[PDB]
Amino acid sequence: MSLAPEADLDSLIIRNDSLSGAVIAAIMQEAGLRAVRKNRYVILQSDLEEAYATQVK
Amino acid sequence: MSNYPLHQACMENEFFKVQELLHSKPSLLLQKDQDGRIPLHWSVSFQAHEITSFLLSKMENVNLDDYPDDSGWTPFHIACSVGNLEVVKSLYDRPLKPDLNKITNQGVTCLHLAVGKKWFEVSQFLIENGASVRIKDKFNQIPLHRAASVGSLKLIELLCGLGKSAVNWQDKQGWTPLFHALAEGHGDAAVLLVEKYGAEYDLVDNKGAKAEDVALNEQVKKFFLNNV
């Protein structure tokens, strides 16, 4: 859905600035589900970092 | 406790509701939800000025630093990422002021959060009350890495200038603030480093490339050498 006003997705892209648009989709999606379980709509940084992990290397 | 109405009340900005929920059960003012967040958190996330200001009145003996959510984000952290100088000044001018350098689980400071998003006031405000312009996050990244990445000369001239920031440090990927401000292609920004704030550019990332090699497109690249 949407990102928390304080989310910081920039941090996530700027790490190895070389991600296939597809991982971005996966990263973004996973982070959606994590936010879903916490019974929230808005996405927190927690979700994203935890998405980045199980989605890259 | 599945649902935490007071917090919700902060999201929806129902000022009364909140003031009405604290009345019924006081132990809520400082309760942590499934995100480790207390009310104040959300009242800052969505910028509920009245709610916030109020919420604080009963947290005047409360150290903001002692309330980081599950990501080490502090109500002053969320404050800085959002971009409201007011809301931030609000959380700052209080008996016990927050540490401008406390980091979050991935070690980023409010300066990063601020800089990255381009909140000049916020960025500047902080720099003025301490805020190390040199804190490395779990990627060996400092705010200037952020500033160059987006490319705001405005913040580049602030970190490097006033905050006498270091400019040749390389993150994990082995990138100086310059690589970043070239991969995202901000020629003008890139040159400002090298040119006005003497940024070395012959270094190479942890793969063998220089800032010129990891530039966005040739249009960008050329403009660099054709002006460095």
Side-chain angles (χ1 to χ4, degrees):
Chain A
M1 48 300 246
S2 55
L3 267 49
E6 84 276 346
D8 168 47
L9 193 58
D10 7 323
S11 69
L12 223 169
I13 59 155
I14 284 169
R15 295 157 195 196
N16 66 290
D17 256 312
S18 292
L19 257 182
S20 75
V23 174
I24 341 301
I27 290 172
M28 278 318 306
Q29 183 187 57
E30 171 60 38
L33 288 60
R34 285 162 179 293
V36 171
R37 302 199 58 53
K38 282 286 175 43
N39 283 297
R40 312 162 314 187
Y41 23 83
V42 36
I43 292 181
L44 302 191
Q45 258 299 353
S46 107
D47 309 309
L48 305 129
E49 302 302 332
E50 288 173 25
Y52 188 48
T54 59
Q55 274 301 170
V56 188
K57 192 172 189 297
Chain B
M1 280 51 264
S2 185
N3 286 158
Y4 309 75
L6 177 46
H7 302 163
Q8 212 88 292
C10 293
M11 294 207 248
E12 301 169 7
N13 203 339
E14 307 286 52
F15 177 43
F16 187 113
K17 220 258 129 180
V18 179
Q19 198 160 179
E20 198 288 295
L21 290 171
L22 294 179
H23 202 178
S24 175
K25 187 178 180 181
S27 59
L28 266 35
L29 177 62
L30 301 169
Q31 153 178 42
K32 300 183 173 296
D33 63 36
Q34 301 292 52
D35 290 300
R37 286 184 173 175
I38 65 164
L40 176 60
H41 269 287
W42 291 121
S43 66
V44 198
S45 170
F46 298 113
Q47 309 177 72
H49 303 66
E50 189 91 59
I51 284 189
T52 303
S53 196
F54 174 60
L55 281 174
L56 311 200
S57 69
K58 310 171 183 303
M59 289 185 226
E60 297 181 302
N61 279 283
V62 158
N63 183 1
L64 286 191
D65 295 357
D66 299 322
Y67 293 92
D69 64 339
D70 287 29
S71 296
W73 285 62
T74 239
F76 179 67
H77 268 295
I78 297 188
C80 302
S81 159
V82 173
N84 201 176
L85 177 56
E86 179 174 308
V87 179
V88 170
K89 289 179 168 289
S90 305
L91 307 169
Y92 192 58
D93 227 76
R94 292 171 53 276
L96 294 75
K97 302 179 176 65
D99 186 4
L100 299 203
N101 295 342
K102 189 188 175 81
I103 57 185
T104 56
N105 281 28
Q106 299 86 210
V108 345
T109 55
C110 300
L111 204 4
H112 293 74
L113 294 183
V115 178
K117 299 204 187 318
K118 307 174 183 178
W119 303 150
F120 201 72
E121 281 49 57
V122 179
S123 310
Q124 174 170 53
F125 177 0
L126 292 164
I127 295 177
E128 302 175 353
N129 295 259
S132 180
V133 107
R134 319 198 161 207
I135 291 192
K136 280 169 281 192
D137 70 357
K138 295 197 179 182
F139 294 109
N140 301 320
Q141 299 195 298
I142 34 166
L144 191 70
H145 272 103
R146 264 172 148 69
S149 193
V150 305
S152 84
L153 309 304
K154 185 172 186 175
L155 284 303
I156 290 190
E157 72 155 355
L158 182 59
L159 291 148
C160 303
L162 194 174
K164 261 67 177 66
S165 167
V167 310
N168 294 96
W169 299 4
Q170 308 189 67
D171 46 35
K172 290 297 169 59
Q173 193 184 188
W175 276 32
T176 44
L178 176 63
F179 280 29
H180 287 291
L182 269 196
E184 296 219 43
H186 299 70
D188 47 307
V191 310
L192 178 64
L193 305 174
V194 178
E195 183 198 301
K196 182 177 293 185
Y197 300 94
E200 298 182 350
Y201 66 61
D202 40 49
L203 294 60
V204 317
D205 63 12
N206 298 177
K207 278 176 181 306
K210 299 166 187 176
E212 65 187 0
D213 305 330
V214 302
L216 188 47
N217 57 210
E218 176 51 11
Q219 208 293 64
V220 170
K221 183 172 186 176
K222 179 172 298 177
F223 182 71
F224 186 57
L225 305 316
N226 286 186
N227 223 299
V228 280

mmCIF file of all heavy atoms in Angstrom, chain B residues 100 123-131 162:
data_model
loop_
_atom_site.group_PDB
_atom_site.id
_atom_site.type_symbol
_atom_site.label_atom_id
_atom_site.label_comp_id
_atom_site.label_asym_id
_atom_site.label_seq_id
_atom_site.Cartn_x
_atom_site.Cartn_y
_atom_site.Cartn_z
ATOM 1 N N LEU B 100 21.636 14.282 19.439
ATOM 2 C CA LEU B 100 21.595 14.491 18.002
ATOM 3 C C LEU B 100 22.373 13.440 17.218
ATOM 4 O O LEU B 100 22.310 13.401 15.986
ATOM 5 C CB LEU B 100 22.146 15.871 17.659
ATOM 6 C CG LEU B 100 21.363 17.023 18.264
ATOM 7 C CD1 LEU B 100 21.616 18.266 17.434
ATOM 8 C CD2 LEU B 100 19.883 16.687 18.276
ATOM 9 N N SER B 123 18.156 19.783 8.468
ATOM 10 C CA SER B 123 19.565 19.484 8.304
ATOM 11 C C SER B 123 20.388 20.526 9.046
ATOM 12 O O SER B 123 21.164 20.192 9.949
ATOM 13 C CB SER B 123 19.933 19.514 6.824
ATOM 14 O OG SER B 123 19.037 18.735 6.058
ATOM 15 N N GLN B 124 20.200 21.788 8.659
ATOM 16 C CA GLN B 124 20.917 22.921 9.236
ATOM 17 C C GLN B 124 20.708 23.075 10.734
ATOM 18 O O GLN B 124 21.665 23.219 11.501
ATOM 19 C CB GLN B 124 20.485 24.190 8.518
ATOM 20 C CG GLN B 124 21.033 25.478 9.097
ATOM 21 C CD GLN B 124 20.758 26.668 8.198
ATOM 22 O OE1 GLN B 124 19.614 26.921 7.802
ATOM 23 N NE2 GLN B 124 21.811 27.405 7.865
ATOM 24 N N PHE B 125 19.448 23.058 11.148
ATOM 25 C CA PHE B 125 19.118 23.180 12.558
ATOM 26 C C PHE B 125 20.052 22.272 13.356
ATOM 27 O O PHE B 125 20.791 22.731 14.226
ATOM 28 C CB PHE B 125 17.657 22.767 12.783
ATOM 29 C CG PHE B 125 17.224 22.779 14.232
ATOM 30 C CD1 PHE B 125 18.106 23.132 15.252
ATOM 31 C CD2 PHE B 125 15.926 22.426 14.575
ATOM 32 C CE1 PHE B 125 17.699 23.131 16.591
ATOM 33 C CE2 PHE B 125 15.507 22.421 15.915
ATOM 34 C CZ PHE B 125 16.396 22.773 16.924
ATOM 35 N N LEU B 126 19.998 20.981 13.037
ATOM 36 C CA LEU B 126 20.798 19.947 13.687
ATOM 37 C C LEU B 126 22.295 20.249 13.726
ATOM 38 O O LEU B 126 22.928 20.228 14.791
ATOM 39 C CB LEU B 126 20.573 18.623 12.966
ATOM 40 C CG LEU B 126 19.185 17.996 13.083
ATOM 41 C CD1 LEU B 126 19.013 16.925 12.006
ATOM 42 C CD2 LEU B 126 19.015 17.409 14.479
ATOM 43 N N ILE B 127 22.854 20.510 12.551
ATOM 44 C CA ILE B 127 24.267 20.820 12.423
ATOM 45 C C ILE B 127 24.655 21.877 13.441
ATOM 46 O O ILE B 127 25.735 21.839 14.029
ATOM 47 C CB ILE B 127 24.561 21.336 11.014
ATOM 48 C CG1 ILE B 127 24.287 20.214 10.008
ATOM 49 C CG2 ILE B 127 25.978 21.868 10.930
ATOM 50 C CD1 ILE B 127 24.458 20.617 8.561
ATOM 51 N N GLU B 128 23.743 22.810 13.659
ATOM 52 C CA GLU B 128 23.966 23.903 14.592
ATOM 53 C C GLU B 128 23.990 23.521 16.075
ATOM 54 O O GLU B 128 24.639 24.195 16.875
ATOM 55 C CB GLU B 128 22.903 24.975 14.368
ATOM 56 C CG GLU B 128 22.888 25.519 12.960
ATOM 57 C CD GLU B 128 21.750 26.483 12.742
ATOM 58 O OE1 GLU B 128 20.901 26.606 13.658
ATOM 59 O OE2 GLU B 128 21.706 27.106 11.656
ATOM 60 N N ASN B 129 23.286 22.460 16.452
ATOM 61 C CA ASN B 129 23.265 22.060 17.852
ATOM 62 C C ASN B 129 24.132 20.831 18.119
ATOM 63 O O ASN B 129 23.862 20.047 19.042
ATOM 64 C CB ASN B 129 21.826 21.804 18.290
ATOM 65 C CG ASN B 129 20.989 23.058 18.257
ATOM 66 O OD1 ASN B 129 20.739 23.689 19.289
ATOM 67 N ND2 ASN B 129 20.562 23.443 17.059
ATOM 68 N N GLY B 130 25.187 20.687 17.313
ATOM 69 C CA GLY B 130 26.095 19.563 17.445
ATOM 70 C C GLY B 130 25.988 18.710 16.204
ATOM 71 O O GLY B 130 26.535 19.057 15.157
ATOM 72 N N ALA B 131 25.271 17.596 16.326
ATOM 73 C CA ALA B 131 25.054 16.675 15.220
ATOM 74 C C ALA B 131 26.306 16.438 14.380
ATOM 75 O O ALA B 131 26.600 17.198 13.452
ATOM 76 C CB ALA B 131 23.930 17.194 14.339
ATOM 77 N N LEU B 162 30.193 24.677 6.166
ATOM 78 C CA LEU B 162 30.027 24.894 7.601
ATOM 79 C C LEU B 162 30.412 23.702 8.469
ATOM 80 O O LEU B 162 31.207 23.840 9.398
ATOM 81 C CB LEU B 162 28.580 25.295 7.896
ATOM 82 C CG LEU B 162 28.276 25.893 9.278
ATOM 83 C CD1 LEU B 162 26.823 26.363 9.299
ATOM 84 C CD2 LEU B 162 28.534 24.877 10.394
#
